[PDB]
Each structure stands twice: as structure tokens, then as C-alpha cells.
Write a protein that binds this ligand. Structure first.
Ligand code: ZN
Ligand code: ZN
Length: 205
DNA sequence: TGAAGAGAAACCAGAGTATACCAGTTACTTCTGTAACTCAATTTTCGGGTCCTAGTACACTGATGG
């Protein structure tokens, strides 16, 4: 919605990089899940025609654009004259952009999404008229879902690297086939591996 | 009065002789690099598409059988 703050769209973009759980759970897979990456790395920024609207709303937020502006303040790199902003003092109605031109939305460190303002139109009477739901999803992609590599009946909850049982190197397992292949009777890892929790992108996105 | 050689008119291979190639080398040039601006021609390379054939997921259908 025009005249609707930025960070009203940043908080709406469903990306699975917000739901990834950190750390490795090989020794014991019953650990209290570390906070999803939505909570740990709260920083993000839009880039709209030479101005990094940074999400400095929270204290855990740090300037992701500082890296780029420093990297460009060095040796000339094509780019030049980068700006900054705060993304809570801005609405889409205050923004000076091109249509159909790719801009940036970086979040979770370097999960980059290419933003394209396809068109701008005055609101009609036959579309949604609310605001409580308006940065709303017109279309999404319906990605594929990874499955457990042992039995192809359930989706992958775990991804293991350097597994001394897996044929493939990154091997995805459901919970059942993971518990059954790597753990003797009480949680002592059998063999060697690095198991991480796997958020299926084709499910939470 | 034959004998042991004397003379005579044929072939026959071979040793110089005659060619017959077949290399063996002296000058005498161009062609490098660097520099520069010019302009057009040509190549390279380089990130990304592009089309195509072949599976793949996934919700639904359509029986099927116990
Ligand atoms: Zn993302
Ligand atoms: Zn499984």
C-alpha cells in the first residue's frame, strides 16, 4: 500500500532465511531449538535507487549497508554517491523509484531479494479495502519440498554433512530416519557427522 | 713330321671417364619493443539467456478389494 511505512513490507516478506535454526545438533538432537534467525539477526535494508533504507528499528539491528558503503568508498567500483536512511521514517509514498527496475532487499546477513515495483495504481473498489492485511501476497511460487532420503514419505527435518552413513554428502532426513540411523539407544551419536536442523524452503515459503 | 709355341680374329668385363645431382655455406636483409594519438576492423571473452528434452512433484481421480 502506498503511504504505508517501509518495515510494513520488510516484516511481511516471507523468506525461509528467517526461520533457520543455528548450531549443530549432532551430539544430541533434542536440544532446545536456538531462536530462529528471525530473532537473532534483526537487521535488513532496502536499496531503492542509491539510498539504503536501513532497518535500525531494533537494538539488535546493525547497519548492513555500512559494508557496502565502505566497499564503495574504496577504489571506484562503478557505483557512487550512496545514501542512507532509516526505513521507519519512510513510506512507499515518499519514495523516488523507477518502475520495472530491479532494486534490493537484503536481510539475514546476505539473503538478497530483488525487488521490482511492477506498477502503481490508485486503489479500486473491487480489491481488498483493509489495511490490517494489505501488504498481501498476490502470488507465490509453490517451491518443491525436499524429502527424507531414506524413505521418501516424509519431508526433511535434518541435513547431515560428513555422515558416515549417508551416500550423498548433504543428506536430508526426516525425524524418524534420522533417529534410527545415527543414535544407538540413548542419544550417543553413532559414527561421525554434523547434523543441522533443516527448514524446508518449499514448506515455510 | 709333328711339337711347342706363333699368329689371328672373335668375345667380355672393368677401370678410368663422364656426368649428375646434391648438398654446403656469406651476406643481406627484415623484424622485433616502446612510445603516442588517431579510427576502423576483427577477435576474444564473458555474463546471461535460450530452447529443448526429460524427469518431478502434487493434488486429484478412479477404481479396487477386503
Ligand atoms: Zn530472504
Ligand atoms: Zn525418512
Amino acid at each position: 500500500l502506498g503511504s504505508q511505512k517501509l518495515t510494513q513490507l520488510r516484516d511481511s516478506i516471507r523468506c525461509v532465511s528467517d526461520l533457520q535454526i543455528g548450531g549443530e545438533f549432532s551430539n544430541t538432537p533434542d536440544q532446545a531449538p536456538e531462536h530462529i534467525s528471525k530473532d537473532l539477526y534483526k537487521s535488513a535494508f532496502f536499496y531503492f535507487e542509491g539510498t539504503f533504507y536501513n532497518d535500525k528499528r531494533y537494538p539488535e539491528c546493525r547497519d548492513l549497508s555500512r559494508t557496502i558503503i565502505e566497499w564503495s568508498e574504496s577504489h571506484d567500483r562503478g557505483y557512487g554517491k550512496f545514501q542512507t536512511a532509516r526505513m521507519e521514517d519512510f513510506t512507499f509514498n515518499d519514495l523516488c523509484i523507477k518502475l520495472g527496475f530491479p532494486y534490493l532487499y537484503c536481510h539475514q546477513g546476505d539473503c538478497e531479494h530483488v525487488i521490482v515495483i511492477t506498477d502503481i495504481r490508485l486503489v479500486h473498489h473491487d480489491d481488498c479495502l483493509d489495511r490490517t492485511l494489505y501488504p498481501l501476497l498476490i502470488k507465490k511460487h509453490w517451491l518443491w519440498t525436499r524429502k527424507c532420503f531414506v524413505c521418501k514419505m516424509y519431508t526433511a527435518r535434518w541435513v547431515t554433512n560428513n555422515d558416515s552413513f549417508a551416500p550423498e554428502d548433504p543428506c536430508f532426513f526426516c525425524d524418524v530416519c534420522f533417529r534410527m540411523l545415527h543414535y544407538d539407544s540413548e542419544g550417543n551419536k553413532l559414527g561421525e557427522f554434523l547434523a543441522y536442523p533443516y527448514v524446508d524452503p518449499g514448506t515455510f515459503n
